[PDB]
Symmetry: C2
Subunit: 176 residues, 2 copies
């Protein structure tokens, strides 16, 4: 961050009194500019015993597979965000069900929230961020070609736990 | 937002082609400025059958009770955030346990995450954000003096479910007041 969004002055890194870490502050308007982590919302679209994955079109990891997911926007709920991201990436209509996974990615100041979801029809197809979209049985999922560990781990757990009953919600951490 | 954080130019609001909502864009450096919701992490510190609440020193609703809670920071996990906000508001050491409540406040683009917590000792006292901090049993909670609906609602549910069993995690939505 180079400039102040409120007045256009150049910002500088200072540790406020009582704190131990720097914040960008603006000496022209005398205000502190806080940075906060970002939420990524998405879901596991289920159809019969299959799940919908998307092959990414945009780096990083083009050609690798993932779940519909992306940055939450302002003026929406978590559920609204997950359904919107699914429609945008996969042209797919889902009903969002239980929150399944919450992951902290502290190194990149991200939080992933992954919901269970019911695919409502098969009339789906790639949006611009996707090369392709399709349903996979558990034995079809290309585990080695999943883009992100934050997607790979909860998905594998989900598929495996649901042989035994309704997968239990869990909280994860992926470090650098 | 008035100026570009990257070049200092004035930003303007415009709807990108293919979109319906406006974004801040900078015509000088030709970039879009995305604004995103903010997480507030907190917890319900439990000691025996009581919970720790804090009386607010700083508006809005100073004089009102809340749970320890605050904006998550960069380079921390959700659990660290919860433990950190409680140490800061109340000088209380907690062990963070299960996530209990996740609320969306779309009108102000916030998400609250509240964890159950074990209070590790009684050697707690106000931080600067708080006038007072203390333990309340269910019959002592000043329900009508709780600052925010997003705190009141889950805590009331928590104290209810606590009677029938060990409280089930839930998602909530609080729409504009
Ligand atoms: Cl929601
Ligand atoms: Cl849920
Ligand atoms: Cl965590
Ligand atoms: Cl948990
Ligand atoms: Cl509220
Ligand atoms: Na997105
Ligand atoms: Na804080
Ligand atoms: Zn300024
Ligand atoms: Zn600019």
């Amino acid at each position: 961050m180079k400039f102040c969004s409120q007045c256009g002055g150049e910002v500088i890194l200072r540790i406020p009194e009582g704190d131990t870490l720097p914040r960008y502050i603006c000496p022209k308007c005398h205000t502190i500019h806080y940075q906060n982590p970002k939420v990524i919302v998405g879901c596991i679209p289920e159809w019969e015993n299959k799940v919908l994955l998307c092959k990414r079109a945009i780096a990083p990891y083009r050609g690798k597979w993932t779940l519909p997911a992306g940055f939450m926007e302002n003026n929406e709920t978590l559920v609204q965000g997950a359904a919107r991201e699914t429609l945008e990436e996969a042209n797919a209509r889902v009903e969002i069900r239980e929150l399944y996974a919450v992951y902290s990615l502290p190194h990149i100041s991200q939080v992933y929230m992954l919901f269970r979801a019911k695919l409502l029809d098969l009339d789906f197809f790639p949006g611009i961020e996707s090369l392709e979209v399709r349903l996979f049985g558990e034995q079809e999922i290309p585990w080695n070609d999943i883009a992100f560990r934050v997607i790979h781990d909860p998905l594998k757990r989900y598929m495996e736990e649901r042989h035994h009953g309704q997968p239990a919600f869990h909280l994860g951490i992926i470090n650098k």
